[PDB]
Amino acid sequence: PLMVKVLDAVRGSPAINVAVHVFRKGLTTEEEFVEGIYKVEIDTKSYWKALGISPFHEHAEVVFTANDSGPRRYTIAALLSPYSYSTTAVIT
Amino acid sequence: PLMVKVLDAVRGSPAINVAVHVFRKGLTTEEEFVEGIYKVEIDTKSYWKALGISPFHEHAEVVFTANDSGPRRYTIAALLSPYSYSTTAVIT
Amino acid sequence: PLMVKVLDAVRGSPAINVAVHVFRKGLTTEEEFVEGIYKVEIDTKSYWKALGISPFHEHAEVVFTANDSGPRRYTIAALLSPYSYSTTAVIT
Amino acid sequence: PLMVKVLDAVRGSPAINVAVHVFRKGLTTEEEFVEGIYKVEIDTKSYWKALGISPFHEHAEVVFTANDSGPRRYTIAALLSPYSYSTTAVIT
Amino acid sequence: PLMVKVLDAVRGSPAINVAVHVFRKGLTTEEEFVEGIYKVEIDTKSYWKALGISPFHEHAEVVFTANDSGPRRYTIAALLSPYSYSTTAVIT
Amino acid sequence: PLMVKVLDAVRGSPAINVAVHVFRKGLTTEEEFVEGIYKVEIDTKSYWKALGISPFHEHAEVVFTANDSGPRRYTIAALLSPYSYSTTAVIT
């Protein structure tokens, strides 16, 4: 008897992000997983990933160059921060 | 008997993002997974991924160049932040 | 007996995004997965992905160039943030 | 007996996005998946994907050039954020 | 008898991020895991990961260069910090 | 009889991040793990990870160069710090 009870009774106005999981039981491999449930990615950069079997195997001249030079701006007043009866403001 | 009960009773006006999962049981491979349930990606860059089997195998001259130089702006006052009875404002 | 009950009773006006999953049981391959349920992608860039088997196998001269230089702007006051009885405003 | 009950009783005027899934059981391949259920993609760019078997196999001179330089603007006051009894306004 | 009870009774308007998990039982491989439940990644950079079996095996001349030089700014007043009855403001 | 009870009764408006886990029972490999539950990564850089079996095996001349020189700024007034009845402000 696996019984899970979450926030069963709520009187009022709560701000919430419920996450409930119940389980009863050649290069990169994954299995039976829960990923990114509430994941938040901002300005995420992947350049060279899982290129392959035998990549650049013989006589490979390679010049790699990452030039991260940008007037970039990110302004998040509430990230994954539920809020009740409040005042949120990005004043810019 | 697998019983899961979530937010069964709500009196009022809550702001919510419910996520409930119940389970009763050549280069990149995945299986039996839950991904991106509420995932939020902003300004995400993948350049060279899973190129293939034998990519650039023989005598490969390669010049790779990433020039991330941009007047880019991202303004999110409430990301995955449910809010009840409040004031949200992006004043720009 | 797999019983799942979510938000069964609601008195009032809640703002919600319900997500409920019940399960009773050559380069890139995937199987039996749930993806992008509420995924939100903004300004997402993939340049070179899964090119193929034997891509650029012999004597390949390659010049790759990413020039991300743009006056781009993204303004989202409420992303995946349900809101009840509130005031949301993008004032720009 | 797989019984799933969601939002069975609603008294009032809630704003909601219900998502319920019940399951009782050469380069890129996928199977038995649920994708893009509520996915929201904004300004998403794929340049070179799944080119094919043996693409650019012999003596290939390639110049690739991405020039992302645009006065582009995206303004969404409520993305996947259901809202009841509120005031949403994109004032620009 | 595995009984889990979380926030069963709420009188008022709390701001919360509930996370409840109940379990009753060639290069990189993973299995049976829960990842990114509420993970928040900001300005995360992966350059060379899982290149492959036999990458640069013979006579490989490689010049790698990361130049992280950017006027980048990130301003988050509330990251994973739920807040009730308060005033949050990014004044810039 | 494994009984777990968390925050069962709440009178008022607390700000909380509940995390409850109940368990009743070729290069890098992992199994049966919970990771990133509330993990927050800011300005995290991985350059050369899991390159592969036999990477740079014979006669490899390699020049690696990381130049982290950026006018980067990160301002988070509340990271994983729930707050009730308070005033949070990033004044810049």
Author numbering:
A (entry chain D), B (entry chain C), C (entry chain B), D (entry chain A), E (entry chain E), F (entry chain F): 11 to 35, 57 to 123
Task: Pull text from the paper.
Each patient was heterozygous for a different mutational variant of the TTR protein (V20I, G47E and V122I, mutational sites refer to mature TTR). The third patient is a man (TTR V122I) who was diagnosed at the age of 51 years. He also showed carpal tunnel syndrome and received a heart transplantation three years after diagnosis. For the three fibrils we obtained spatial resolutions of 3.18 Å (V20I) 2.37 Å (G47E) and 2.99 Å (V122I), based on the 0.143 Fourier shell correlation (FSC) criterion. The other two mutations (V20I and V122I) are seen in our 3D maps and occur within the fibril cross-β structure. Yet, they exist in different chemical environments: while residue 20 is part of the N-terminal fibril protein segment and located at a buried and hydrophobic position, residue 122 is located in the C-terminal fibril protein segment and affects a solvent-exposed position. Both mutational changes are chemically conservative and insert not more than a single methylene group into the mutant protein, all suggesting that the two mutations are not stabilizing or destabilizing to the fibril structure. All three fibril samples contain both mutant and WT TTR protein. A superposition of the three structures shows that the fibril protein folds are virtually identical. The backbone root-mean-square deviation of all 92 resolved backbone Cα atoms was analyzed with Chimera25 and found to range from 0.5 Å to 0.7 Å for the three structures.
Systemic ATTR amyloidosis is an increasingly important protein misfolding disease that is provoked by the formation of amyloid fibrils from transthyretin protein. To investigate the relationship between mutation, disease manifestation and fibril morphology, we have determined the cryo-electron microscopy (cryo-EM) structures of several ATTR amyloid fibrils, which were isolated from the amyloidotic tissue of patients with hereditary ATTR amyloidosis. Based on cryo-EM, however, we find essentially the same fibril structure in all patients, demonstrating that the mutations do not necessarily lead to different fibril morphologies. Each molecular layer consists of two discrete density regions that correspond to two ordered segments of the fibril protein: an N-terminal segment, extending from P11 to K35, and a C-terminal segment that spans from G57 to T123 of TTR protein.
